[PDB]
Design a protein around this ligand. Structure first.
Ligand SMILES: Nc1ncnc2c1ncn2[C@@H]1O[C@H](C[C@@H](N)CC[C@H](N)C(=O)O)[C@@H](O)[C@H]1O
Ligand SMILES: Nc1ncnc2c1ncn2[C@@H]1O[C@H](C[C@@H](N)CC[C@H](N)C(=O)O)[C@@H](O)[C@H]1O
Ligand SMILES: NC(=[NH2+])NCCC[C@H](N)C(=O)O
Ligand SMILES: NC(=[NH2+])NCCC[C@H](N)C(=O)O
Ligand SMILES: O=S([O-])[O-]
Ligand SMILES: [Cl-]
Ligand SMILES: [Cl-]
Ligand SMILES: [Zn+2]
Ligand SMILES: [Zn+2]
Ligand SMILES: [Zn+2]
Ligand SMILES: [Zn+2]
Ligand SMILES: [Zn+2]
Ligand SMILES: [Zn+2]
Lengths: 269, 269
């Protein structure tokens, strides 16, 4: 039905879904409505969307929001959106959403290109926004909610828990997109944590390079590779708090204790 | 002698070398002269220096260059430089050299803070410049010149070889700095490769996450963690060129073949 509208638009502009940048388009109308009501889009909201595709999500956002900014990398899609729709309140921004400057907004509603799930999320969590409702692959959504000390707890999980309140609203079947992905997706709600734990990105990267390591092994490994000498940092690193944990068992609070200790001992400035 | 001038300035402003940001100051005058003559600093040059410290290298650059930009993170040092020197042709840039916007320049001459050796180098190699003469730790300098398939060949090595012509001019003893480091340093000369191999940063990062892996194992690992499905990329990744190598054995040219193949098959856009 919406699938049919898609097939019509695809053949009309003689374009086929290029899995290059990411082009599994959402074609179930009620998934769109559910995303939008979950974000509570109203006449006061300024929305950011990444990857409008053929504008099915965009069109519904435009009806309810004060203003939509939508970042699209593909100039052909942009031309088609402009020809196909008449919105008063949508600003299309050409570029890679990972690279371009984001406008100010209070909400995000997006079917994210799954290839930028990871950088997109880290950028978002660094933003001031009230609420984000975003579609991801299910495994990635589950990684975002992973608990310290689970197998799939990673840098993403830590930063999500440090900076956000994250919730899987529902799973979404393969059948909801064209073309079909071979894994279920998930609709995810993110709000800023009221009591954010701001962590040093270099530290986390260093620690989570190899998240299976004990925290001492990890720390010495990562700062020696920067170009430092390890004779220089052995002792200090050795007294590091939470030293009998592996990196994948660390809570944000515990990373923060490591941070402050490293700052106190000169390691991070 | 220059050591003495340092002790005088240190006690005068009541500051001690803080290994926090990095403050092993160069105190042999002939190392400075050697760095400067190796870079061939002349009245036409615009020089970038990172970490002026108490301005011993800076002052020599200033008397020979058209213009010096010098990036200093520590506001106290900046105050001292401005009181202690009367330069007409030096712009001091307050900030972390890794974070701040760089000036245009044709040469770099610097005792780099060893903590930013790695990010500094990757930024530099992406710049248009005629020549850089930079002090690093010896181990890091040796990593920069490591050969494909050696133990210490890493992302740094690959990008240096892809984008630069690199040479260790000479080793520099511990005794050349105050305070003393416990490892030798090295003066390194870098020029742009005339036929640069421009590589995709994400690809290299992905490959070199775990550089001991075969190239297939590496590729599937890194793009699945971005948030994509691996059922989606198995076949394509499987036919990838140079697949019988481990990532640490790859020449820039071989990475470029991997890049082009991945672009052709939609994986990188
Ligand atoms: N990095 C990017 N920045 C902005 N728009 C993008 C980017 N990558 C893909 N797009 C656009 O995203 C739209 C499709 C997405 N909304 C959904 C894609 C689907 N979830 C997938 O992962 O394949 C298309 O119009 C693409 O051109
Ligand atoms: N990230 C940075 N950006 C700019 N200046 C810096 C940075 N880190 C340290 N500095 C300054 O760099 C100066 C020292 C460097 N030129 C030499 C440092 C020596 N190679 C070391 O690693 O200890 C000091 O004045 C520091 O304040
Ligand atoms: N402010 C909040 N903590 N919101 C969370 C409630 C959102 C709710 N989980 C949903 O399904 O819509
Ligand atoms: N254009 C070049 N590749 N020059 C390299 C010559 C620099 C020389 N290695 C030195 O010790 O000063
Ligand atoms: O400069 S490091 O050797 O302390
Ligand atoms: Cl409408
Ligand atoms: Cl090969
Ligand atoms: Zn597909
Ligand atoms: Zn409409
Ligand atoms: Zn603990
Ligand atoms: Zn080493
Ligand atoms: Zn998996
Ligand atoms: Zn090969």
């Amino acid at each position: 039905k919406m699938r049919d509208r898609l097939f019509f638009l695809l053949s009309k502009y003689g374009i086929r879904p290029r899995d290059s940048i990411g082009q599994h388009f959402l074609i179930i109308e009620d998934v769109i409505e559910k995303a939008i009501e979950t974000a509570n889009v109203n006449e006061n909201d300024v929305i950011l969307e990444v990857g409008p595709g053929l504008g099915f999500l965009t069109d519904e956002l435009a009806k309810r929001a004060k203003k939509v900014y939508t970042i699209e990398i593909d100039q052909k899609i942009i031309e088609i959106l402009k020809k196909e729709y008449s919105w008063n309140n949508v600003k299309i921004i050409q570029g890679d959403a990972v690279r371009v400057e984001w406008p100010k907004f209070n909400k995000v509603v997006s079917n994210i290109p799954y290839k930028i799930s990871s950088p997109f999320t880290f950028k978002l969590l660094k933003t001031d926004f009230e609420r984000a409702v975003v579609m991801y692959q299910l495994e990635f959504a589950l990684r975002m909610v992973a608990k310290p000390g689970s197998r799939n707890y990673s840098r993403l999980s830590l930063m999500a828990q440090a900076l956000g309140n994250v919730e899987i609203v529902m799973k979404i079947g393969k059948g909801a997109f064209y073309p079909r992905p071979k894994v279920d997706s998930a609709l995810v709600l993110i709000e800023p944590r009221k009591d954010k734990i701001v962590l040093n990105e270099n530290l986390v990267k260093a620690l989570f390079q190899h998240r299976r390591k004990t925290v001492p092994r990890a720390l010495k490994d990562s700062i020696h590779m920067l170009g430092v000498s390890k004779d220089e940092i052995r002792g200090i690193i050795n007294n590091v708090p939470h030293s009998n944990k592996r990196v994948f068992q660390l809570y944000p609070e515990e990373v923060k204790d490591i941070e402050e200790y490293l700052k106190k001992h000169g390691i991070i400035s």
